[PDB]
Design a protein around this ligand. Structure first.
Ligand SMILES: COc1ccc2c(c1CN1CCNCC1)O/C(=C\c1n[nH]c3ccccc13)C2=O
Length: 264
Protein backbone atom coordinates (compact mmCIF):
# COMPACT_ATOMS: atom_id res chain seq x y z
CA UNK A 1 0.00 0.00 0.00
CA UNK A 2 2.99 2.38 0.41
CA UNK A 3 6.21 2.68 -1.54
CA UNK A 4 9.03 3.29 0.96
CA UNK A 5 11.70 5.87 0.15
CA UNK A 6 14.74 7.17 2.01
CA UNK A 7 15.09 7.40 5.78
CA UNK A 8 14.32 10.97 6.96
CA UNK A 9 15.36 10.60 10.57
CA UNK A 10 15.43 8.29 13.54
CA UNK A 11 15.99 8.05 17.28
CA UNK A 12 15.08 5.88 20.28
CA UNK A 13 11.38 6.48 19.55
CA UNK A 14 11.69 4.83 16.10
CA UNK A 15 12.25 5.91 12.48
CA UNK A 16 10.65 8.06 9.81
CA UNK A 17 10.80 7.40 6.04
CA UNK A 18 9.79 9.33 2.98
CA UNK A 19 7.08 7.49 1.09
CA UNK A 20 4.42 7.50 -1.63
CA UNK A 21 0.84 6.26 -1.39
CA UNK A 22 0.69 3.70 -4.22
CA UNK A 23 -2.97 4.37 -5.15
CA UNK A 24 -2.67 8.12 -5.97
CA UNK A 25 1.09 8.93 -5.76
CA UNK A 26 0.49 11.18 -2.72
CA UNK A 27 3.72 12.06 -0.88
CA UNK A 28 3.67 10.77 2.70
CA UNK A 29 5.94 10.20 5.68
CA UNK A 30 5.96 6.82 7.34
CA UNK A 31 6.69 6.93 11.02
CA UNK A 32 7.56 3.77 12.97
CA UNK A 33 7.04 4.05 16.68
CA UNK A 34 8.62 1.41 18.96
CA UNK A 35 6.13 0.02 21.50
CA UNK A 36 8.70 -0.29 24.31
CA UNK A 37 9.75 3.38 23.92
CA UNK A 38 6.23 4.78 24.21
CA UNK A 39 5.97 6.17 27.76
CA UNK A 40 2.43 7.57 27.37
CA UNK A 41 -0.41 5.45 25.99
CA UNK A 42 -3.94 6.54 25.07
CA UNK A 43 -7.24 4.95 24.06
CA UNK A 44 -9.51 5.80 21.11
CA UNK A 45 -4.83 1.22 23.10
CA UNK A 46 -2.54 3.44 20.92
CA UNK A 47 0.36 5.87 21.31
CA UNK A 48 -0.78 9.22 22.74
CA UNK A 49 0.58 10.69 19.49
CA UNK A 50 -2.24 9.00 17.54
CA UNK A 51 -4.88 10.32 20.00
CA UNK A 52 -3.47 13.85 19.74
CA UNK A 53 -3.16 13.83 15.96
CA UNK A 54 -6.73 12.61 15.51
CA UNK A 55 -7.92 15.44 17.81
CA UNK A 56 -6.13 18.05 15.65
CA UNK A 57 -6.14 16.29 12.22
CA UNK A 58 -9.76 17.39 11.86
CA UNK A 59 -9.83 19.96 9.04
CA UNK A 60 -7.17 22.24 7.54
CA UNK A 61 -4.38 23.77 9.60
CA UNK A 62 -0.67 24.35 10.31
CA UNK A 63 -0.51 20.84 11.79
CA UNK A 64 0.74 17.83 9.76
CA UNK A 65 -2.27 15.56 9.27
CA UNK A 66 -2.41 11.87 10.24
CA UNK A 67 -3.71 10.01 7.17
CA UNK A 68 -3.74 6.45 8.49
CA UNK A 69 -2.06 4.26 11.06
CA UNK A 70 -1.29 0.54 11.54
CA UNK A 71 -0.36 -1.65 14.44
CA UNK A 72 2.38 -4.32 14.37
CA UNK A 73 3.54 -6.70 17.11
CA UNK A 74 6.37 -4.41 18.29
CA UNK A 75 5.47 -1.04 16.81
CA UNK A 76 2.86 1.31 15.41
CA UNK A 77 3.20 2.76 11.94
CA UNK A 78 1.86 6.25 11.25
CA UNK A 79 1.18 7.68 7.80
CA UNK A 80 1.57 11.44 7.76
CA UNK A 81 1.17 14.25 5.24
CA UNK A 82 4.37 15.23 3.42
CA UNK A 83 4.73 18.55 1.60
CA UNK A 84 7.11 18.53 -1.37
CA UNK A 85 9.40 20.42 -1.61
CA UNK A 86 9.83 20.77 2.18
CA UNK A 87 12.50 22.00 4.62
CA UNK A 88 12.41 21.99 8.43
CA UNK A 89 12.96 25.31 10.16
CA UNK A 90 16.25 24.21 11.78
CA UNK A 91 17.85 23.48 8.36
CA UNK A 92 16.32 26.63 6.93
CA UNK A 93 17.91 28.78 9.66
CA UNK A 94 21.21 26.86 9.39
CA UNK A 95 21.38 27.74 5.66
CA UNK A 96 20.17 31.31 5.74
CA UNK A 97 21.37 32.57 9.12
CA UNK A 98 19.24 34.88 11.30
CA UNK A 99 15.94 35.68 9.57
CA UNK A 100 14.78 39.10 8.51
CA UNK A 101 12.14 40.30 10.94
CA UNK A 102 9.47 40.39 8.22
CA UNK A 103 10.09 36.71 7.58
CA UNK A 104 10.33 35.78 11.27
CA UNK A 105 6.98 37.61 11.81
CA UNK A 106 5.22 35.54 9.11
CA UNK A 107 6.68 32.27 10.39
CA UNK A 108 6.08 33.04 14.06
CA UNK A 109 2.48 34.13 13.33
CA UNK A 110 1.79 30.79 11.56
CA UNK A 111 3.29 28.85 14.43
CA UNK A 112 1.08 30.79 16.86
CA UNK A 113 -2.02 29.97 14.75
CA UNK A 114 -1.01 26.27 14.71
CA UNK A 115 -0.42 26.16 18.46
CA UNK A 116 -3.71 27.96 19.13
CA UNK A 117 -5.44 25.30 17.01
CA UNK A 118 -3.87 22.51 19.05
CA UNK A 119 -4.84 24.17 22.36
CA UNK A 120 -8.40 24.84 21.10
CA UNK A 121 -8.58 21.09 20.29
CA UNK A 122 -7.41 20.08 23.78
CA UNK A 123 -3.86 19.21 22.68
CA UNK A 124 -0.52 20.40 24.08
CA UNK A 125 2.50 19.78 21.79
CA UNK A 126 5.24 20.08 24.50
CA UNK A 127 8.19 20.10 22.01
CA UNK A 128 7.75 23.24 19.87
CA UNK A 129 11.10 24.01 18.23
CA UNK A 130 12.69 24.68 14.83
CA UNK A 131 13.25 20.96 14.10
CA UNK A 132 9.50 20.22 14.58
CA UNK A 133 8.37 22.84 12.09
CA UNK A 134 8.18 22.09 8.36
CA UNK A 135 8.10 24.74 5.70
CA UNK A 136 6.02 24.00 2.59
CA UNK A 137 8.42 25.93 0.37
CA UNK A 138 6.01 26.55 -2.60
CA UNK A 139 3.18 27.87 -0.41
CA UNK A 140 5.14 29.56 2.42
CA UNK A 141 3.08 27.49 4.90
CA UNK A 142 4.45 26.11 8.17
CA UNK A 143 3.37 22.77 9.68
CA UNK A 144 3.87 21.40 13.17
CA UNK A 145 5.14 17.85 13.44
CA UNK A 146 5.96 15.25 16.07
CA UNK A 147 3.31 15.02 18.78
CA UNK A 148 5.27 12.18 20.35
CA UNK A 149 5.95 14.21 23.51
CA UNK A 150 2.54 15.83 23.69
CA UNK A 151 -0.41 15.47 26.08
CA UNK A 152 -4.06 16.34 26.51
CA UNK A 153 -4.30 19.98 27.56
CA UNK A 154 -5.29 20.35 31.26
CA UNK A 155 -5.37 23.27 33.74
CA UNK A 156 -3.32 21.58 36.47
CA UNK A 157 0.43 20.93 36.79
CA UNK A 158 2.47 18.61 34.55
CA UNK A 159 5.24 16.63 36.25
CA UNK A 160 6.48 14.75 33.20
CA UNK A 161 8.50 16.23 30.34
CA UNK A 162 10.32 14.54 27.45
CA UNK A 163 10.55 17.41 25.00
CA UNK A 164 13.73 19.41 24.32
CA UNK A 165 15.61 20.66 27.42
CA UNK A 166 17.02 23.92 26.01
CA UNK A 167 13.45 24.87 25.04
CA UNK A 168 12.14 23.93 28.50
CA UNK A 169 11.15 26.55 31.03
CA UNK A 170 12.97 27.47 34.27
CA UNK A 171 10.09 26.06 36.39
CA UNK A 172 10.76 22.65 34.81
CA UNK A 173 14.54 22.98 35.33
CA UNK A 174 14.08 23.89 39.02
CA UNK A 175 10.92 22.22 40.33
CA UNK A 176 10.14 19.61 37.67
CA UNK A 177 6.65 21.19 37.44
CA UNK A 178 4.96 23.43 34.82
CA UNK A 179 1.60 24.47 33.46
CA UNK A 180 0.72 23.82 29.82
CA UNK A 181 0.12 27.24 28.27
CA UNK A 182 2.85 29.12 30.07
CA UNK A 183 5.43 26.40 29.26
CA UNK A 184 4.33 26.58 25.59
CA UNK A 185 4.78 30.39 25.56
CA UNK A 186 8.31 29.96 26.98
CA UNK A 187 9.20 27.57 24.12
CA UNK A 188 7.72 30.13 21.71
CA UNK A 189 10.01 32.81 23.17
CA UNK A 190 13.03 30.44 22.57
CA UNK A 191 11.77 29.85 19.02
CA UNK A 192 11.31 33.52 18.16
CA UNK A 193 14.82 34.30 19.55
CA UNK A 194 16.16 31.46 17.40
CA UNK A 195 14.50 32.88 14.28
CA UNK A 196 15.83 36.42 14.69
CA UNK A 197 19.29 35.57 16.12
CA UNK A 198 20.03 32.29 14.29
CA UNK A 199 20.60 30.26 17.48
CA UNK A 200 18.84 29.60 20.82
CA UNK A 201 19.55 32.00 23.70
CA UNK A 202 20.39 29.49 26.47
CA UNK A 203 22.55 26.32 26.48
CA UNK A 204 22.96 25.44 30.17
CA UNK A 205 20.46 25.02 33.03
CA UNK A 206 22.04 27.99 34.81
CA UNK A 207 21.38 30.36 31.90
CA UNK A 208 17.74 29.18 31.68
CA UNK A 209 17.26 29.73 35.42
CA UNK A 210 18.90 33.17 35.24
CA UNK A 211 16.73 34.15 32.23
CA UNK A 212 18.88 37.09 31.10
CA UNK A 213 18.48 37.49 27.39
CA UNK A 214 21.49 38.70 25.43
CA UNK A 215 20.94 39.59 21.78
CA UNK A 216 23.78 38.49 19.52
CA UNK A 217 22.26 40.05 16.37
CA UNK A 218 20.58 43.38 15.65
CA UNK A 219 16.93 42.98 16.70
CA UNK A 220 14.32 45.74 16.90
CA UNK A 221 13.27 46.92 20.33
CA UNK A 222 9.69 45.70 19.78
CA UNK A 223 10.83 42.18 18.90
CA UNK A 224 13.24 42.12 21.86
CA UNK A 225 10.38 43.15 24.15
CA UNK A 226 8.05 40.36 22.89
CA UNK A 227 10.85 37.82 23.29
CA UNK A 228 11.66 38.96 26.84
CA UNK A 229 7.95 38.85 27.73
CA UNK A 230 7.65 35.25 26.44
CA UNK A 231 10.77 34.42 28.47
CA UNK A 232 9.56 35.90 31.78
CA UNK A 233 10.95 33.84 34.67
CA UNK A 234 7.58 33.80 36.44
CA UNK A 235 5.16 31.65 34.40
CA UNK A 236 2.18 33.93 35.16
CA UNK A 237 4.13 36.95 33.87
CA UNK A 238 4.23 35.43 30.34
CA UNK A 239 1.77 36.67 27.72
CA UNK A 240 -1.30 34.71 26.56
CA UNK A 241 -1.53 33.75 22.87
CA UNK A 242 -3.87 36.72 22.46
CA UNK A 243 -1.35 39.11 24.01
CA UNK A 244 1.38 37.75 21.71
CA UNK A 245 -0.72 38.18 18.60
CA UNK A 246 -1.83 41.70 19.65
CA UNK A 247 1.80 42.76 20.32
CA UNK A 248 2.91 45.69 18.15
CA UNK A 249 5.74 43.59 16.63
CA UNK A 250 3.12 41.11 15.29
CA UNK A 251 1.12 43.61 13.24
CA UNK A 252 0.79 43.60 9.39
CA UNK A 253 1.89 39.96 8.88
CA UNK A 254 2.54 38.82 5.31
CA UNK A 255 0.26 36.19 3.81
CA UNK A 256 1.89 32.76 3.38
CA UNK A 257 2.00 33.07 -0.42
CA UNK A 258 3.54 36.59 -0.25
CA UNK A 259 6.07 35.14 2.21
CA UNK A 260 6.94 32.47 -0.36
CA UNK A 261 7.22 35.03 -3.23
CA UNK A 262 9.42 37.47 -1.29
CA UNK A 263 11.56 35.16 0.85
CA UNK A 264 11.46 31.68 -0.53
C1 LIG B 1 14.54 12.46 14.25
O1 LIG B 1 13.69 12.66 13.10
C2 LIG B 1 12.31 12.76 13.18
C3 LIG B 1 11.68 12.52 14.40
C4 LIG B 1 10.30 12.59 14.55
C5 LIG B 1 9.57 12.95 13.43
C6 LIG B 1 10.18 13.19 12.20
C7 LIG B 1 11.57 13.11 12.04
C8 LIG B 1 12.23 13.42 10.69
N1 LIG B 1 12.72 14.82 10.58
C9 LIG B 1 13.83 15.08 11.51
C10 LIG B 1 14.39 16.51 11.34
N2 LIG B 1 13.31 17.51 11.31
C11 LIG B 1 12.16 17.21 10.48
C12 LIG B 1 11.65 15.80 10.77
O2 LIG B 1 9.26 13.54 11.18
C13 LIG B 1 8.01 13.50 11.71
C14 LIG B 1 6.77 13.79 10.97
C15 LIG B 1 6.56 14.17 9.55
N3 LIG B 1 5.30 14.26 9.09
N4 LIG B 1 5.42 14.65 7.75
C16 LIG B 1 6.71 14.78 7.40
C17 LIG B 1 7.31 15.14 6.19
C18 LIG B 1 8.70 15.21 6.12
C19 LIG B 1 9.49 14.92 7.24
C20 LIG B 1 8.91 14.56 8.44
C21 LIG B 1 7.52 14.49 8.49
C22 LIG B 1 8.13 13.14 13.13
O3 LIG B 1 7.12 13.03 13.92
Amino acid sequence: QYQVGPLLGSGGFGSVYSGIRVSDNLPVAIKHVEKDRISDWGELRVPMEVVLLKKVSSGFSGVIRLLDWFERPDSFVLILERPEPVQDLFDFITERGALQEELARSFFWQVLEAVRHCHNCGVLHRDIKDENILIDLNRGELKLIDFGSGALLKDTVYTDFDGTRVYSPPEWIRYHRYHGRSAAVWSLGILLYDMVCGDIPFEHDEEIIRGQVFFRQRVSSECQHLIRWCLALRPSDRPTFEEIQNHPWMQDVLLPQETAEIHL
